Design a protein around this ligand. Structure first.
Ligand SMILES: NC(=O)C1=CN([C@@H]2O[C@H](COP(=O)(O)OP(=O)(O)OC[C@H]3O[C@@H](n4cnc5c(N)ncnc54)[C@H](OP(=O)(O)O)[C@@H]3O)[C@@H](O)[C@H]2O)C=CC1
Ligand SMILES: NC(=O)C1=CN([C@@H]2O[C@H](COP(=O)(O)OP(=O)(O)OC[C@H]3O[C@@H](n4cnc5c(N)ncnc54)[C@H](OP(=O)(O)O)[C@@H]3O)[C@@H](O)[C@H]2O)C=CC1
Ligand SMILES: OCCOCCOCCOCCOCCOCCOCCOCCOCCOCCOCCOCCOCCO
Ligand SMILES: C[C@@H](Nc1nc(N[C@H](C)C(F)(F)F)nc(-c2cccc(Cl)n2)n1)C(F)(F)F
Lengths: 413, 417
């Protein structure tokens, strides 16, 4: 009857994405696929009840079963503490999971040909791999109050000679200073994840640094990537007629705007983070941005939407006002997780299903059925009328009918 | 009968831009302008021979004569050391010059009517206000060879106790660490140049930081800009119905991509570096962008192309293949440098020459004669044929033809009379 899906780790989420997540399971997944589902409720309340232990348990389950699909979750702040009366201000579950798995998140826009892009020549997506460790995000910065000397020092653990460098001698007034770092193993894992992602997609890979300026700091990224490429991955790239190349960051961003798309882009922490919103708006909507965490083994993945829980739409839903929330990124978390599960298990039936759900979602939007965010990209939000879009539940119903028709004609060979 | 040009500091560069540089001088400058030329060879080989002292010499010359025009230069890494057998990995000459001169680098695309953009919304220009001092260009980075503790310390001049901050304790391996800084006074001058540029153009101004992560480092930039705005510029902005607003760099990049253009973008050193190439490409080509470093005094300027030596095109040139590198940005380094020289000396003839060469450049491209990069914006790179563009030297020939006619008509005109 149903396709045997295998073991999948499922992580339930919050707010509007929580509603869509159950609609996806009930209307798109469960009628056709039978899964060994290991479910973890990462809803903000269950996280509070378990003192965030449910988040660590889910990450360990992903490590054992190799495939996880996650719904967007609330990252607590001070207002969230008051809203839910949380015991503590729990940290981001995405950060906790990524730190336990040790992978790199790759974000990819889902492209439908009728949705215009802000950059004219983009025909294929640009997949950015984000090294989410170190650099500015673990740095120590401080105000320099007046004249004085700032130095950075290194004291070896083996008791050998301590090294000291002059950062700056403030002579006239004050200013600011900061120290930051990165780690060899994290960079090596970042490289492995990047090479594995490029090989799975069959696309070339680019790493961006500023090693001409940061000769030691950024040069280490360039050296680690090149040595791992030359020793472990180059023949696989050549056999697929792809390649790896290092580029300076300023040249790289311009090359990305000029390109047609269709490459993997390994980004340092800052470079990947600061442009994520622009890539989403550049291709259309945040609702079309999916993501996958790829571990250096190439075997363990965790897929999820690259956007949040869409709190503003959830507030409208709570007051009975019509919402039109895009489910594509959430749906593609399931198809990408299920497609990886099928690749691990040599499951042709599941691989066919995952691709069929992708085609169904793209064909539906390209046929003119879309949510308000996509209609606004075509027409401009001030010009969007009610007849231009389907609400959140109508669009899920339309996807469910098209998927049923697609699989029914696929069963007729 | 040549135009008396005055004192100009010239800095020769590397690879493809070095070849274009000589063509500009022999075809567009030397036949029409007689200069008191102070030339410094910043080619990678002469920098290696002088142990990079020629770079410091050029910066001091710019300080003395107040006008510098620089060709793009190689900043070496390990690959360049082996290529040229260098004595060491010399620091970027631009970082050295900018950190001696200080100030703000203003960068803006060169717009021709027949060149489609990559960002269709950018109907107005975007001017990048790039802080030229500190941050990554004056950073101290090193390899961490193994387990150990990295700390950053502050020892105040007032004799009180040293302050020690833990950066990271490497426990099981090695990695990298670095320290960087900036100075209150240079941030203040950066703010003043940004506000004054916005008021001169009549456009709003935005400053982008990452103060959500670097609350102290980037918070200082945000605080200094807001302090100077509220106390010295806010009323003037409101008189022109413009404004200044701080933006998170994440929001600013997305906001700029959705925008109509027509604003000044004050950027920190690293961000202004990336945005220079990105904004140039969005309007058409890296070869169509000016860049002028303006020192806090306003008297000294260093003009340059925003792009690099175009190594990839030079590699084709070395193979004996025809290349179509865009020389406009390098030409506008000369015209912008000479225009400031004319302003300092109140040299009407030289001021006319600089503007005339810029007009000839625009007019030549808008007439259909352009390099391959601009033909690709019109036709799309998969569709461009050899018949659609000129190589670098044919294009320089066409410019020289039109400039000779333009300057000949100027000397017969009434304004010269
Ligand atoms: N993956 C994760 O677990 C992440 C979770 N979050 C959490 O999500 C919550 C909300 O964060 P927020 O800043 O609002 O960011 P969101 O991504 O949730 O939403 C921001 C805006 O983007 C638009 N948007 C995003 N996703 C969709 C979609 N699927 N369909 C239609 N429009 C969409 C909406 O615009 P408009 O209002 O104009 O219609 C929305 O208001 C926070 O608690 C945050 O911590 C945040 C980031 C990642
Ligand atoms: N101000 C300076 O002195 C600078 C010096 N450099 C140095 O230059 C060298 C090369 O740097 P790189 O990263 O390649 O950056 P470049 O700016 O030199 O070139 C990158 C790419 O941009 C395009 N491009 C740039 N300028 C032009 C132009 N005038 N006409 C047409 N296309 C152009 C070309 O793209 P395509 O290949 O698609 O045709 C080129 O391959 C390095 O040694 C670097 O240190 C770099 C930046 C600034
Ligand atoms: O057939 C499936 C299709 O279903 C469509 C969507 O289904 C949604 C189901 O989501 C998953 C839930 O299923 C698992 C069971 O979960 C148990 C409860 O899960 C918690 C989800 O939150 C539900 C809302 O309750 C939150 C409790 O309130 C806390 C704060 O309360 C504030 C006061 O309430 C405000 C109500 O609105 C006010 C409007 O003015
Ligand atoms: C989606 C765009 N990515 C991107 N765009 C810009 N600039 C835009 C062109 C604009 F000027 F409009 F803001 N900058 C960056 C960047 C990256 C790393 C560090 C920094 Cl500081 N910036 N990334 C892409 F790919 F289309 F170029």
């Amino acid at each position: 009857k149903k396709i045997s899906g295998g073991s999948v780790v499922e992580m339930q989420g919050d707010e509007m994405t929580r509603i869509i997540w159950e609609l996806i399971k009930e209307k798109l997944i469960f009628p056709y696929v039978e899964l060994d589902l290991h479910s973890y409720d990462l809803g903000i309340e269950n996280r509070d009840a378990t003192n965030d232990q449910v988040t660590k348990d889910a990450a360990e389950a992903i490590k054992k079963h190799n495939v996880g699909v996650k719904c967007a979750t609330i990252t607590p702040d001070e207002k969230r503490v008051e809203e839910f009366k949380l015991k503590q201000m729990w940290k981001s579950p995405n950060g906790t999971i990524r730190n336990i798995l040790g992978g790199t998140v790759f974000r990819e826009a889902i492209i439908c040909k009728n949705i215009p892009r802000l950059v004219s020549g983009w025909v294929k997506p640009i997949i950015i791999g984000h090294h989410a460790y170190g650099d500015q995000y673990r740095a120590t910065d401080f105000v320099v109050p007046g004249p004085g000397k700032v130095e950075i020092t290194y004291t070896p653990s083996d008791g050998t000679q301590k090294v000291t460098y002059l950062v700056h001698n403030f002579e006239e007034g004050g200013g600011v200073a900061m120290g930051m770092y990165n780690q060899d193993k994290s960079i090596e894992d970042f490289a492995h994840s990047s090479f594995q992602m490029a090989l799975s997609k069959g696309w070339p890979l680019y790493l961006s640094t500023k090693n001409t300026i940061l000769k030691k700091y950024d040069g280490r990224f360039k050296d680690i990537f090149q040595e791992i490429y030359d020793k472990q991955y180059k023949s696989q790239f050549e056999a697929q007629k792809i390649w790896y190349e290092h580029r300076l960051i300023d040249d790289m961003v311009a090359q990305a705007m000029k390109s047609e798309g269709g490459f993997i882009w390994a980004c340092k922490n800052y470079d990947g983070d600061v442009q994520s919103d622009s890539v989403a708006q550049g291709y259309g909507s945040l609702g079309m941005m999916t993501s996958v965490l790829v571990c250096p083994d190439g075997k363990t993945v965790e897929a999820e939407a690259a956007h949040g829980t869409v709190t503003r739409h959830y507030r409208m839903y709570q007051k009975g006002q019509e919402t039109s929330t895009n489910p594509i990124a959430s749906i593609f978390a399931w198809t990408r997780g299920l497609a990886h599960r099928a690749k691990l298990d040599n499951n042709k039936e599941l691989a066919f299903f995952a691709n069929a759900l992708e085609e169904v979602s793209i064909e539906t939007i390209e046929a003119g059925f879309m949510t308000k965010d996509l209609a606004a990209c075509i027409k401009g939000l001030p010009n969007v009328q009610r007849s231009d879009y389907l609400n959140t539940f109508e669009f899920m119903d339309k996807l469910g009918e098209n998927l049923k028709i697609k699989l029914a004609q696929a069963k007729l060979s």
